[PDB]
């Protein structure tokens, strides 16, 4: 006859060892360092920080190394680590006007006060595989202009001064924190922005692309994309006054969106907002576009695309949840499958009878 | 008969690691005069897969493919099609394909080059399968 | 045994395409294709240049019996790899002479209303482009009017004047004489003077 | 003991306290899905995070923890969860349902009847029984609130009309305390009757969906059905090939490509109990 | 020649569901009403004869041209310029997101109108002719009542003065006064503009006042045909007798 | 007054140099090699191969290095390179039955012929950030079992032999190639599978997750997930007989999906299929789930979710297109913006009047 | 000359031939979007791939190439495209519209009138003018096929009713050869009249959307409008601050945060031509 044996634990251990060996790869090659990943794979690090929820470059690079480059797994690792960390303080609201700029562009005006700073970007590069990277090379010597940073007013402040757009006013409303309470639909714009920042880059990019193609269009222009170092300050209870704890490299995107004609005020442009850690800006642009799409209830817009369906967009945006639930099908399901089979086998017999 | 043997040795050469094949060929010190008919060209092989593994065909991307053709002094044409982008490996494979069609080289290289390469690959596969099978989940044993 | 294609396939194809584009975008304008010294007899220089410039494995080519020759077929297969079909209805490019019939002409694919580009292009070899019945062309590509008198079969003349196939359906006609080429797309309004 | 460097049961005291309040609210409102601020666990969402959180919030040093997946203690994920709990709590573990104080289960209720002071914690993918009828929470929350379960009855009626039977074979909806329609987790219909008037506390955790719900001991749990189409549990023409039981839920094991198969108890502990008794 | 000739037309979803072997003729300036028990295939026949449903059998000629032998573009042009189609559900022949003025003016612009002011004026005039106020021109039909929506779909399909208008229960949801106002309008258009109408209705009074000829359908089969007065006052088929007796 | 000056070219060159320097990062750290990325970041390489369209590990790793770890940019680099490569041959249809397995699992049966081979996987790992990776470590010594590979029949072949599922039959239909002709909607299943394989992992994962949550559900079970080495063979014209050109590491996923009851045949399970390069399997699972969702027209299913909307899913699936079009908003748009402004300023002046 | 290692113009001969056939079909069917098997370019989709492909397919050694974006030759993307074409073709380049044989443009038609034998190639994001009304191609293809443009007229009527004006300011739809409604690319309404009866061939390339369409020389291009709301081009109260032209399309340059701005010609070549003439 047959006897049951124990195989689960040793199979798990062997699978983990196989995965670890594959992660290490050929031992003749030196092992990758987290510092190298942080410096040279910086855009993957940016995505992992933004979606995992921690703006720590070293931790994101460590997650990428541990995940064998899998962005989804690295993001989940970072989020799981976040769960284990005590919250020591809440930052004072970020002031992007104080950003030390690495890159500042505007698509709405040819030239603006402070100028079109391209900065480090792949924009306008010819995407031809550079095989010289197969061997060690020499970094280029950077050209140096004047060291001063020109006044860079937000382009939306220039639009609002003309009455073409509305200033984003602060009413003192307490932001919703979906990390402490589960989202409740319909969600406030603060909750929506928080979720979108954590959302999958590809999903939101596809939704924004659909909006550009008529599936809930909002006539977007890149009013300004700002990347740079923004100082973080906290008001500790031990002192009672603001202390600057450091600076974070972040990218801010502001989108002008189709004008509206309210009954009691002059017609004006609408807007969307995106904010991400690091330099990767397409996530911020997609965030702004989907934010504007989800603003439909405020503007009484008739939804014409899934990007405007708040529950559908947000419930499936977090790739932690989505990847986990899709991968869970790999778990043993033979009890449930036996139930489905038990029924199907009876339906076959009855149909044949 | 002969076509199956040629297919076998071409597959062995294609699956061989370029380094080991080059080392083995250098050790054999084969003196052959050949003309390159087609220079080693790196391109794409379009991958056809099947729905459900057995059904209708669909295009599952592409893979890099390198091909080379040589001609020996006696008019024997050697060919190679190998995944990847190693032009020198493709040229060596085509040269060996041409040589193996000659009586004075077939049995010699079948025993000194093709068999030792296939055996080494089989050993690598067996070792990897031994490593992998440790992850098999044991449930029931017949008593 | 096979005929020779362009000496400089890239540059020659580019130049021939530019001449054909000039002819098609400006209907009735005669353009000369000088890149090919001799055509694939009985195909003329212009017809051979057009086929070499446009024909490939994705474009079935039908040759009429007067112009269908073993040497021509092998040369086309070798240089373009264009499939050769025996029926005009299966042809992306149709090559005929003055002996074309009303049946072959109407068998040519005219495209569909949703895919008007899925039709055929007819390369008609004419005796001359000057000595025929006077024709007045008006429409896209023509400022006010153009006068051309190609020697045309009656079925081709009837297709151009009456346009039985409503726009966007219809064939685009290419008249070839030696190295000279004239083009009349389906849009051109053709009147008999 | 716990010697892993984490807090006992890996949860911070605030998260434990919030989950405990949610558990009490769920007990006071049987069948109702209580939202809770679930945190991301070392296991991916959809791999038992809700059950892990519930166990961590309830578990103590003196508890004996039993973890089963598909009814088996040796299942991969059950092994992973049990090892995690051993690492971060050091509690005693058992494969015997009788000796367990806490049972965390995925898709099976043990064959051995549960007793007083036992808590069984279910892992739930979809806490909303009406989700597959109405995917949107904005509607199902109100359907729960206004006790509008007409969409489920229509679904069952249409399933009978189309097939002659109710298509749902697992995660079969059950009315709790006569009011709340509840998803019992993806346990088979075979196990649903065990829920009725059970002497053990039943806790249900959906970590990804951020819901917790519970059934107190000795609570009425009635599977939705019709008088002429009464609730019928799965049945097999063969007994277990190892212990010979005809009363256990059976898993089909395929032995070869030729179609030879054997049916064996999914509840491995019950299988061992029967086999030893001979 | 008849304006619309139908010969052996048939379209059945299942035995007894739809219509089969239906033939008739329609000349300009006359109305052909159709009556029958609910589910008799009147709507299916109306859709088939209005180029909205390809028949399984038979033929339809319009001005000596087979209706379904022409290209889809020609049929679309006919339904866009010179053919009105009033649907049983008013919203089917309306654009929800487009105002009433836009709904009426789409048909005008399709006919070549390119003056915004004249289009708006004509839309206002027709809104008033069908008893809807002019100030609702900019309002969407979703904010209108069922009768208002039906009277908007009549105005939309009569603004272009089409030659042939197909209707399915046009009077449904309309009060008696606006019903008679809409019957008088149709009579005026028919006598003046020589408009042809094919109307499906259950209110025999509307057919008597409007329909020049009448058809009776039962189980998808045309049982009775001829003049409206003769059919209503001197019915032959038992179902026609029952229907006339049921008159309140 | 003002005079125009030339600044575009030098700004572009300086921006590219800045990006290249940032990619190199701190020079004290050794430059990353493509071999290291291929070996140790293998899952990112897998995604880049699958979406970029070339199953060349070295090229994908090179693109990742060149892209500073940006998966979208690396994928586009690989696709652009693909454009420059001549097509030398079309492979004979892949035979996954001949796969040399690294991993073979089935969720529908507890144990199957050939067994549950977990292989190298992160499944069942505790996602705790491993800080030992911050320093160099030693790879574990792998346990060794018997070297033989057990017969592994496809689980769907076991289901079809019982009549529970239908064999996927080959009618000889010529596959559609969307790389040669633009997709035409509705697309054939071959075209749909080809597009999905190239589609964004996050977008398809979100769509599949939505289907699991009731937005067009198909009751999925992971009938079998197979990863391993599959031989590629071509029939060259120079020889006329099949030649084996090598092996490719690929992952195949087969999903059982909700049974149907056709009028004239016994009720049976439906199915979905996914196939990817490398080991990353969640892409294959999402591909199978979305394939089943897009099978709705074949089964006459009433769409209940966007995942079943073929045009919406496919037109926005390719992240090359989506990322390009979202990022294009960064391009100067001041001519178009001036047009929108010219109108708004008038509609502001006509409202105030 | 070309010394980059790629084929002349970077396109393989098969792709060039397919695009050439598409161009001829588009010329024979003015206004119709001809699908073509577009390939991925070294530039991202949405950054001018269609125009790059068209230029590569038409360009020759003897052509003089002019590349402008927003009307300026020095614009970033225009510089990138021109440098790519110089690298892979070696053709002569010019900033003067008069001296150009091939003009690849993004969002502007040059102020200088075009002449015979000139080809102007437009870069098109959305080749379908009805897309923003009907996002689905399955419907717009049939709308084109059956000349059902009623949705555009209604859109214009509703825009007038809501605002008193037509909201569309750029990419303004135009009827071509009296039949096909066409998107002229995101050029402003200012440039649309230049399209009518032009003596130069106009080619439109949407690489991402895989469409090519064309307008032959001397073809009727009529912007959709109403008699009482005639097509009116953009207007400014100021002339160009550099050359003083009142007839050129103007771009607004913001000089400071205080709101000081100057309007200058977008067509930089025309601006230079006017300034030199004084
Ligand atoms: N798609 C369909 N499938 C099956 N049967 C259908 C379908 N559409 C209509 N039928 C049936 O065909 C018959 C004709 O219906 P139809 O709508 O033409 O009736 P009718 O006489 O116009 O109705 P009424 O006057 O009550 O509005 C009815 O039995 C209807 O149920
Ligand atoms: O959301 P989580 O993390 O708490 O996972 C709960 C359940 O969701 C998945 O689906 P499943 O029921 O097949 O089993 C898995 C898991 O136990
Ligand atoms: O699809 P492609 O790659 O050919 O890009 C065509 C056009 O699409 C984008 O939108 P745009 O009009 O603002 O300018 C960009 C670009 O020129
Ligand atoms: Mg009806
Ligand atoms: Zn499950
Ligand atoms: Zn047993
Ligand atoms: Zn744009
Ligand atoms: Zn100027």
Residue numbers in the entry:
A (entry chain C), F (entry chain G): 1 to 353
B (entry chain E): 3 to 145
C (entry chain F): 2 to 194
D (entry chain D), G (entry chain H): 2 to 279
E (entry chain J): 3 to 250
Which passages does the manuscript contain on this structure?
In Escherichia coli, the 14-cistron phn operon encoding carbon-phosphorus lyase allows for utilisation of phosphorus from a wide range of stable phosphonate compounds containing a C-P bond. The crystal structure of a core enzyme complex, Phn(GHIJ)2, revealed a symmetrical hetero-octamer consisting of a compact, central tetramer of the PhnI and PhnG subunits each interacting individually with the more distal PhnJ and PhnH subunits. Here, we show using single-particle cryogenic electron microscopy that PhnJ mediates binding of a double dimer of the ATP-binding cassette proteins, PhnK and PhnL, to the core complex. ATP hydrolysis induces drastic structural remodelling leading to opening of the core complex and reconfiguration of a metal-binding and putative active site located at the interface between the PhnI and PhnJ subunits.
3D classification of the data collected under ATP turnover conditions yielded structures of two additional states of the core complex bound to PhnK and in some cases PhnL. In both structures, the density for PhnK is significantly poorer than in the stable PhnL-bound state, suggesting it is more flexible and possibly therefore that PhnL acts to stabilise the closed conformation of PhnK. In one of these conformations (closed, 2.0 Å, 81,605 particles, C2 symmetry), the PhnK dimer is in the closed ATP-bound state and resembles that found in the Phn(GHIJKL)2 structures while the density for PhnL is absent. Inspection of the active site reveals clear density for both ATP and Mg2+ suggesting that this is a pre-hydrolytic ATP-bound state. In the closed state, both PhnI subunits and one PhnJ subunit interact tightly to form a Zn2+-binding site located at the interface of the three proteins (the His site). In addition to two histidine residues originating from PhnI (His328, His333), the Zn2+ ion is coordinated by three water molecules and an oxygen from an unknown ligand, which was also observed previously by X-ray crystallography, in an octahedral arrangement (closed). Based on inspection of the EM density we were able to model the ligand as 5-phospho-α-D-ribose-1,2-cyclic-phosphate (PRcP). The ligand is tightly bound at this site with specific interactions between the ribose moiety and PhnJ Arg107 and Gln124, contacts between the 5′ phosphate and a loop (residues 47–50) in PhnJ and finally between two oxygen atoms of the 1,2-cyclic phosphate, PhnJ His108, and Zn2+. Presumably, the inaccessible nature of the metal binding site between PhnI and PhnJ prevents ligand dissociation in the closed state.
